[PDB]
Amino acid sequence: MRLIPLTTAEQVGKWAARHIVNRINAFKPTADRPFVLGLPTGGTPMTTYKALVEMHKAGQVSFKHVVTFNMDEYVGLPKEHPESYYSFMHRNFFDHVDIPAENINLLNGNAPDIDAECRQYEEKIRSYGKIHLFMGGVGNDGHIAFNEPASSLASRTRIKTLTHDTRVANSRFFDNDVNQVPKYALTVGVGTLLDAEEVMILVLGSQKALALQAAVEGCVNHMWTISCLQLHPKAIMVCDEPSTMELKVKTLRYFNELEAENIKGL
Ligand SMILES: CC(=O)N[C@@H](CO)[C@@H](O)[C@H](O)[C@@H](O)COP(=O)(O)O
Ligand SMILES: CC(=O)N[C@@H]1[C@@H](O)[C@H](O)[C@@H](COP(=O)(O)O)O[C@@H]1O
C-alpha cells in the first residue's frame, strides 16, 4: 500500500485531483475505450471535487470519455432531495464538467426491485470491463462505502442496513436529526471494490485516526472493512495530519521518506 502523509484537507484534495488527472491523461481514453472512474460522496471528497473542477476549467482534463460509477445511495430518499447522493454528485461535480449524461451511473435507491437493481449495476460495470480507479473515503467505524462492520470481504453490490453510529454521523446533513437519516443504503461490495484496478482512499481528521490505524497497522477483518485494502495490489491512502495520530512513529517515518518527492511536490 502507499500512504501519502499531507498536512491539510486542501493538500489532500489537490494531491488526489492531480492523481486522477494524470491517470486519465496517461490512459488516453476514447469512445471505444473510456476511462472508468468510481466516485464517493460526503464531506471527505469536497476539496477533491473542487480541485477537479478547477483543473477542468483550466483545460487540463476532459471527462468526455470518462464513465463514472458511484459507491452508494440511500434507499427510499427522493432523488430530488438535496441530501440524496444523486443531488450531491450533480451539484458538486457533474454540473460543472463536460461529462456526457450517458456516461453517468448511479444506484437507484427507489428501485421497486432492489436485488434486480443491484445485479444490473454489477452487470453495467462488467460490460465496461473494470473500474480503473475507485476513489472513496472511510467511516469512523472503518466502513468502506456502506460496507458496515461484519460485512463479507467478498461481498457484491447489495442493500445494507446502516449502523446507529453511521446514522448519527450522517445526521449533520439531515439537520442534526438521526430520525431523518435513512436506515438503508444500496452499496457496492468489498469484492466489487477489490476488483477495481486502483483504489484511492481519502482520510481527513482526527475522527478517522482509529480507522486509519486499523487499515494500516491492523489485521484483515470484516469489522473494519477498510482493512481489505491490505489485499489489494494497488491501494493508496491520502491523509491529512490529524488522521495520522494513532500510527507508530516508525510507520509514519517510513511513508514520509517514501513520498517526500511526491508531495514536495509543492
Ligand atoms: C459524517 C461521517 O463522517 N460519518 C461516517 C462515519 O461513520 C460515515 O457515515 C460515512 O458514510 C463515511 O464514508 C465517511 O465519509 P465522510 O466522513 O462524510 O467524508
Ligand atoms: C521506489 C519504491 O519503493 N516504489 C514502490 C512501489 O514499487 C510500490 O508498489 C509501492 C508499495 O506498495 P506495495 O508493496 O503494496 O506494492 O511503494 C512505492 O511506490
> What distance in angstroms lies between residue 86's CA and the mean position of ligand 2's atoms?
36
CA-CA distances (angstroms) from residue 80 to 39, 106, 110, 188? 20, 14, 12, 22
Q: How many domains does the chain have?
A: 1
- Experimental method reported for this structure: X-ray
Identify the residue whose C-alpha is closest to ligand 2 atom 3.
258
> What distance in angstroms lies between residue 62's CA and the mean position of ligand 1's atoms?
29
DSSP the chain: -EEEE-SSHHHHHHHHHHHHHHHHHHH---SSS-EEEEE--SSTTHHHHHHHHHHHHTTS---TTEEEEESEEETT--TTSTTSHHHHHHHHTGGGS---GGGEE---TT-S-HHHHHHHHHHHHHHH---SEEEE---TT--BTTB-TT--TT--SEEEEPPHHHHHHHGGGTTT-GGGS-SEEEE--HHHHHTSS-EEEEE-SGGGHHHHHHHHTS---SSSGGGGGGG-SSEEEEE-SGGGTTS-HHHHHHHHHHHHHHH---
Measured from the CB, is residue 169 less than 6 Å from ligand 1?
A: yes
State residue 83 phi and psi, 5-degree precision.
-95, 0
Q: Would you say 227 and 215 are in contact if contact means Cβ atoms under 8 Å apart?
A: yes
Residues with CB under 6 A from ligand 2: 1-2
Residue 240 CA to residue 90 CA, distance in Å, equals: 26
Indicate which residues carry an active-site annotation.
72, 141, 143, 148
* Strand duo 72-74 + 184-187: pairing: antiparallel
Domain that holds residue 236: 1-266
Contacts of 157 (CB under 8 A, 6+ apart): 107, 118, 119, 121, 122, 186, 187, 188, 189, 192
Identify the residue whose C-alpha is closest to ligand 1 atom 3.
169
> What distance in angstroms lies between residue 229's CA and the mean position of ligand 2's atoms?
14
Measured from the CB, is residue 44 less than 6 Å from ligand 1?
A: yes
Residue 209 CA to residue 245 CA, distance in Å, equals: 6
Identify the residue whose C-alpha is closest to ligand 2 atom 13.
1
Residue 28 CA to residue 69 CA, distance in Å, equals: 19
> What distance in angstroms lies between residue 24's CA and the mean position of ligand 2's atoms?
21
Identify the residue whose C-alpha is closest to ligand 1 atom 8.
139
CA dihedral defined by 217, 222, 228, 231, rounded to 10 degrees?
90
Residue 160 CA to residue 145 CA, distance in Å, equals: 10
Judged on CB neighbours under 10 Å (0-12, 13-18, 19+), 241 is: middle
- List the one residue out of 187, 231, 226, 191 whose CA is nearest residue 208: 226
The CATH number of the domain where 97 resides is what? 3.40.50.1360
C-alpha cell at 264: 514536495
State residue 50 phi and psi, 5-degree precision.
-50, -55
Ligand 1 atom nearest residue 173's Cα: 1
- List the one residue out of 201, 191, 189, 93 whose CA is nearest residue 146: 189
C-alpha cell at 7: 498536512
